Amino acid sequence: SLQNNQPVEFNHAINYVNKIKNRFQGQPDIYKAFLEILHTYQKEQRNAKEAGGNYTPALTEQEVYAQVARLFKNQEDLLSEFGQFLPDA
Amino acid sequence: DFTPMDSSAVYVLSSMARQRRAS
């Protein structure tokens, strides 16, 4: 089951894609790129998760953070905010 | 009011968030 008290993924992720959508609303290239990174990273994460460990994920935490870091220059706010999402361990 | 990626963006985002400090 899911929760309802103190929603982190909801408010955070939603406001994330929202702010970025309204920010680079004129640049669909960089926006599509980022989305493509998380997309491929998602599928690689799911598959690798179902595999166990004998699988070799294509994109890792460093792959995404790097490409994303290259996607933007003067806009580091996105990189930091994104880091907040990056699973802590 | 709001329109997501209409794909699975909410999933990957929810993954990084939930997995944070988890496991």
PDB file of N, CA, C and O in Angstrom, chain A residues 2 4 6 11 18 22 41-43 49-50 52 57 60 62 66 69 72 77 79 84 88-89:
ATOM      1  N   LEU A   2       0.253   2.386  -0.336  1.00  0.00           N
ATOM      2  CA  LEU A   2       0.966   3.659  -0.375  1.00  0.00           C
ATOM      3  C   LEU A   2       0.640   4.498   0.858  1.00  0.00           C
ATOM      4  O   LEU A   2      -0.157   4.090   1.703  1.00  0.00           O
ATOM      5  N   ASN A   4       0.083   8.740   2.586  1.00  0.00           N
ATOM      6  CA  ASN A   4      -0.592   9.999   2.291  1.00  0.00           C
ATOM      7  C   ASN A   4      -0.035  11.129   3.148  1.00  0.00           C
ATOM      8  O   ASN A   4      -0.188  12.306   2.817  1.00  0.00           O
ATOM      9  N   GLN A   6       2.898  13.369   4.573  1.00  0.00           N
ATOM     10  CA  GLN A   6       4.232  13.830   4.196  1.00  0.00           C
ATOM     11  C   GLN A   6       4.698  13.166   2.898  1.00  0.00           C
ATOM     12  O   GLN A   6       5.563  12.290   2.919  1.00  0.00           O
ATOM     13  N   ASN A  11       5.112  15.720  -4.256  1.00  0.00           N
ATOM     14  CA  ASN A  11       5.417  17.148  -4.308  1.00  0.00           C
ATOM     15  C   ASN A  11       6.751  17.445  -4.997  1.00  0.00           C
ATOM     16  O   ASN A  11       6.835  18.346  -5.832  1.00  0.00           O
ATOM     17  N   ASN A  18       7.509  20.046 -13.441  1.00  0.00           N
ATOM     18  CA  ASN A  18       6.703  21.241 -13.673  1.00  0.00           C
ATOM     19  C   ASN A  18       7.582  22.471 -13.890  1.00  0.00           C
ATOM     20  O   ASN A  18       7.461  23.159 -14.905  1.00  0.00           O
ATOM     21  N   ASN A  22       8.187  24.517 -17.483  1.00  0.00           N
ATOM     22  CA  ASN A  22       7.870  25.930 -17.652  1.00  0.00           C
ATOM     23  C   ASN A  22       9.136  26.753 -17.867  1.00  0.00           C
ATOM     24  O   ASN A  22       9.086  27.858 -18.409  1.00  0.00           O
ATOM     25  N   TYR A  41      17.407   5.117 -18.026  1.00  0.00           N
ATOM     26  CA  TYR A  41      17.913   4.797 -16.697  1.00  0.00           C
ATOM     27  C   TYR A  41      16.865   4.026 -15.904  1.00  0.00           C
ATOM     28  O   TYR A  41      17.193   3.159 -15.092  1.00  0.00           O
ATOM     29  N   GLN A  42      15.598   4.344 -16.155  1.00  0.00           N
ATOM     30  CA  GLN A  42      14.491   3.685 -15.474  1.00  0.00           C
ATOM     31  C   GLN A  42      14.379   2.230 -15.913  1.00  0.00           C
ATOM     32  O   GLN A  42      14.287   1.327 -15.083  1.00  0.00           O
ATOM     33  N   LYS A  43      14.381   2.013 -17.226  1.00  0.00           N
ATOM     34  CA  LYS A  43      14.281   0.669 -17.783  1.00  0.00           C
ATOM     35  C   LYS A  43      15.477  -0.185 -17.372  1.00  0.00           C
ATOM     36  O   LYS A  43      15.344  -1.385 -17.132  1.00  0.00           O
ATOM     37  N   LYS A  49      16.986  -4.663 -11.530  1.00  0.00           N
ATOM     38  CA  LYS A  49      16.360  -4.980 -10.253  1.00  0.00           C
ATOM     39  C   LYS A  49      15.722  -6.366 -10.288  1.00  0.00           C
ATOM     40  O   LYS A  49      15.771  -7.108  -9.305  1.00  0.00           O
ATOM     41  N   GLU A  50      15.125  -6.708 -11.424  1.00  0.00           N
ATOM     42  CA  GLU A  50      14.476  -7.999 -11.593  1.00  0.00           C
ATOM     43  C   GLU A  50      15.502  -9.099 -11.853  1.00  0.00           C
ATOM     44  O   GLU A  50      15.234 -10.278 -11.617  1.00  0.00           O
ATOM     45  N   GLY A  52      18.668  -9.172 -10.447  1.00  0.00           N
ATOM     46  CA  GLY A  52      19.324  -9.496  -9.195  1.00  0.00           C
ATOM     47  C   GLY A  52      20.662  -8.799  -9.043  1.00  0.00           C
ATOM     48  O   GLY A  52      20.812  -7.906  -8.207  1.00  0.00           O
ATOM     49  N   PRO A  57      23.866  -2.898 -15.727  1.00  0.00           N
ATOM     50  CA  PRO A  57      23.110  -1.691 -16.084  1.00  0.00           C
ATOM     51  C   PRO A  57      23.877  -0.784 -17.042  1.00  0.00           C
ATOM     52  O   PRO A  57      25.061  -0.515 -16.841  1.00  0.00           O
ATOM     53  N   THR A  60      24.165   4.386 -15.092  1.00  0.00           N
ATOM     54  CA  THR A  60      24.236   4.379 -13.638  1.00  0.00           C
ATOM     55  C   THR A  60      24.010   5.779 -13.082  1.00  0.00           C
ATOM     56  O   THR A  60      23.751   6.719 -13.835  1.00  0.00           O
ATOM     57  N   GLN A  62      26.084   7.791 -12.008  1.00  0.00           N
ATOM     58  CA  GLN A  62      27.107   8.671 -12.559  1.00  0.00           C
ATOM     59  C   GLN A  62      26.805   9.029 -14.011  1.00  0.00           C
ATOM     60  O   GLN A  62      27.100  10.137 -14.457  1.00  0.00           O
ATOM     61  N   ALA A  66      26.081  12.885 -14.832  1.00  0.00           N
ATOM     62  CA  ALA A  66      27.056  13.449 -15.763  1.00  0.00           C
ATOM     63  C   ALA A  66      26.370  14.102 -16.960  1.00  0.00           C
ATOM     64  O   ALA A  66      26.523  15.302 -17.194  1.00  0.00           O
ATOM     65  N   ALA A  69      24.492  17.004 -16.054  1.00  0.00           N
ATOM     66  CA  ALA A  69      25.398  18.092 -15.707  1.00  0.00           C
ATOM     67  C   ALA A  69      25.912  18.780 -16.965  1.00  0.00           C
ATOM     68  O   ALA A  69      26.244  19.965 -16.947  1.00  0.00           O
ATOM     69  N   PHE A  72      23.074  21.170 -18.841  1.00  0.00           N
ATOM     70  CA  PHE A  72      22.974  22.546 -18.368  1.00  0.00           C
ATOM     71  C   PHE A  72      24.346  23.095 -17.992  1.00  0.00           C
ATOM     72  O   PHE A  72      25.268  22.336 -17.694  1.00  0.00           O
ATOM     73  N   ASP A  77      21.088  24.674 -10.493  1.00  0.00           N
ATOM     74  CA  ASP A  77      19.987  24.420  -9.575  1.00  0.00           C
ATOM     75  C   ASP A  77      19.341  23.067  -9.862  1.00  0.00           C
ATOM     76  O   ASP A  77      18.947  22.350  -8.943  1.00  0.00           O
ATOM     77  N   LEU A  79      20.825  20.442 -11.195  1.00  0.00           N
ATOM     78  CA  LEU A  79      21.754  19.387 -10.808  1.00  0.00           C
ATOM     79  C   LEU A  79      21.651  19.091  -9.315  1.00  0.00           C
ATOM     80  O   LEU A  79      21.627  17.932  -8.905  1.00  0.00           O
ATOM     81  N   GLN A  84      19.235  15.598  -4.866  1.00  0.00           N
ATOM     82  CA  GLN A  84      18.359  15.316  -3.734  1.00  0.00           C
ATOM     83  C   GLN A  84      17.580  14.026  -3.971  1.00  0.00           C
ATOM     84  O   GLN A  84      17.305  13.272  -3.037  1.00  0.00           O
ATOM     85  N   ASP A  88      20.186   7.935  -1.491  1.00  0.00           N
ATOM     86  CA  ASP A  88      21.290   8.086  -0.546  1.00  0.00           C
ATOM     87  C   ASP A  88      21.652   6.748   0.091  1.00  0.00           C
ATOM     88  O   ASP A  88      20.776   5.976   0.478  1.00  0.00           O
ATOM     89  N   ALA A  89      22.951   6.485   0.198  1.00  0.00           N
ATOM     90  CA  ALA A  89      23.435   5.243   0.791  1.00  0.00           C
ATOM     91  C   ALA A  89      24.920   5.338   1.125  1.00  0.00           C
ATOM     92  O   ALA A  89      25.746   5.032   0.238  1.00  0.00           O
TER      93      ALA A  89
END
